[PDB]
Design a protein around this ligand. Structure first.
Ligand code: FES
Ligand code: FES
Lengths: 118, 118
């Protein structure tokens, strides 16, 4: 059982005083993109108000009983399909530990933290 | 029950090509400082090799059954006693949610991620 938490408040990493306007929050756009796609077996997408990774939006988290927990950031709504593929690999992997060379590039380069299984 | 993971591999946030080399890695020193200090009830200090927060050393994580998980970074070995105090407040708070203004400054400003309870 894999849970993919997606922050719905996240703003992008652009400099707010310099960036052009707002619109819907990227985290909200990412959440919607994740919900439009087929959710893999074993994965459940759960929106959250904040993953305390605000400086690295968009942020999502992967966790499950007996597995490592992961937080990834600096994501974009267009990463939704790769995120769900990653979440599937997370569900299949032993303890959530995906072999490094098999992880999507965003999981290798944009991981913010991991936590040992409870 | 509360587990405080501490990364023993962490180096500081100083520019590696420009700095010095010191002695042991700061994450080692932080782990040793934590284990030498008295530990509040219900808290266990667990050394780990890496919390995948390497750009934000030193890194520690708090987790416990039914509680939010947290990762804090950019810590120093001298923070060990404040970290342990935070661990006690985390152990005492329902779901690990310490009242905001009661949290140590390091927990308010240097949290890298939080994950909802499993
Ligand atoms: S706004 Fe998304 S992690 Fe805080
Ligand atoms: S070396 Fe400390 S989090 Fe990776």
């Amino acid at each position: 059982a894999t849970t993919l938490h997606v922050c719905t408040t996240c703003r992008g990493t652009a400099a707010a005083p310099l960036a052009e306007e707002a619109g819907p929050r990227p985290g909200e756009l990412l959440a919607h993109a994740l919900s439009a796609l087929p959710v893999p077996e074993g994965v459940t997408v759960v929106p959250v108000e904040c993953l305390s990774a605000c400086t690295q939006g968009c942020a999502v988290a992967l966790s499950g009983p007996g597995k490592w927990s992961y937080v990834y950031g600096r994501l974009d709504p267009r990463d939704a399909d790769t995120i769900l593929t990653g979440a599937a690999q997370f569900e299949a992997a032993e303890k959530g530990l995906i072999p490094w060379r098999e992880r999507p590039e965003i999981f290798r380069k944009q991981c913010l933290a991991r936590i040992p299984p409870q």
